[model samples]
Target: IRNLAVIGECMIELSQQGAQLTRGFGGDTLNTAVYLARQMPEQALRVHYVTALGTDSFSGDMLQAWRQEKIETGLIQQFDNKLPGLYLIETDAAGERTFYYWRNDAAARYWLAGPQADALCERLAQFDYLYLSGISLAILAPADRMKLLALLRRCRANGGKVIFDNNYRPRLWQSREETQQAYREVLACTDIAFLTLDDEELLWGAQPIEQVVARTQALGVGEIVIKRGAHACLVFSGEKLEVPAIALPPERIVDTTAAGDSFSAGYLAARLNGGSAQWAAQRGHLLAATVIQHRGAIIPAAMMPEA
Candidate 1:
């Protein structure tokens, strides 16, 4: 099986509807990995999450949950000194969500700071794929961020593809300039990238979709998928879009949150299974269509659409 390491933090997710609170796990990269693993068969790919967690019961349960979903947790780092982060998702009647985060001292921030970090990187550098997001970089210390970039380079050198999702949350960084620089470094190492056009416009200045394509491709990214909510997505390689998002009704979209993330997961899942770009995009729309109909970051596992 192809081994793919998804590097990020998983927070205790609280979803609020009126006075009711539902608890679960969520984080952009982690969410994508879950959706990806759920949609993929074991023989096609093995998804492993790389991050640090405490010895707490929540951590243990989270680990067990991943296993049940067929996501590998063998590369996980557990720390005695830290605890996991917590966040709450508040949604309005329209199903739009707002996030409240309390993750400053989370164990995930110490993942690369631990003693076993070097050994972990050694194994990670040889994986078939290394997947992460802008939030993964945002949560790291400056020194560890440097280490993470080095690991990406080493993984690429070892013939492993680096996949990145630009799930940028401006609050996580010091300023737009810092976020831009961080994005530049991350994109420099990216083989395949899933970007929200709104995020790209926020990080860099607003430009035409073609300009955005030219810009990222110039930075060395070979595969770029630009997501525009309610609008058809744009996919560009060295040339023009080989495939674009097929139109789906705005009425079909119940909630646009994670639409792009799930799209990336579905697209990549198909690609990894030897499907063409158009087929991958079709799979993305199929999943995103179903996901939008539900509330919160993760839909009911039983209610998930067929892969």
Candidate 2:
């Protein structure tokens, strides 16, 4: 079995339910981990989630849930005094969502701060594949971020491929300039990149798609996938490939959360399993189309796309 590690923070997610709230867990890399596990059998890809959580009831439940989905939890650490972060999701009439966070003091922010981080980095560098998102870098301090980047470099040097998703959360970052600097560094080490056109434009301003692809390719990324919601998604390797997104009726989109995350998961599941890039892009769109029709970051396992 191939070892795949997803690094990020998983938070207590609270979604509005008509004057009430429904609690769950969700994060960019965490969401991708779940979807990736769902698409591929555990025997084929052994998935591990790398993050720090509190020694609390919520953390216990989160661990249980992940294991039930066949995700490995051996690499996760627990802080005695710290707690997992929490966030509330608010959706509008158009099914678009906004997030409000209560996580400045969360345990995940200090994941790489303590002395144990060295050992953790050493272990991570041996994985077959390492996946992380932009938010993963944004949540760390400058020093810890440097440590994480070094770990990525080590992992690459050890023959592990790095997968990066540009899931930019503006509120979590200190400044646009700081975020851009970190992104540039991460992109340089990324073997495959899952980018959203909206995010690229938001971060680097309005530029032609060709220019955007060229810039990212120049950063040493071997594969680039650009997601354009409701429109076609573009993939750049030796040649440019455009795969149109599955058209869903406006009413079918119950909530747009996790759409991109699930897409990345589908794409990777196929790509890593020896499928062609065109087929992998189609798999991504299929999963994303089904996800938007659901109300949460994760759909029922039965609702997952058939392999």
> Evaluated with TM-score, which candidate comes out highest?
2
Looking at model 1, the pairs that clash are: none
Worst 10 residues of 1 by lDDT: 237-246
Q: In model 2, which regions exceed 4 Å deviation?
A: 91-96
Question: On residues 73-137, what C-alpha lDDT tens digit does candidate 1 reach at each position?
Answer: 99889988788999998988876678899999999998999989999999999999999999999
TM-score of each: 0.95, 0.97
- Assess each prediction's global lDDT (C-alpha) against the native: 0.86, 0.91
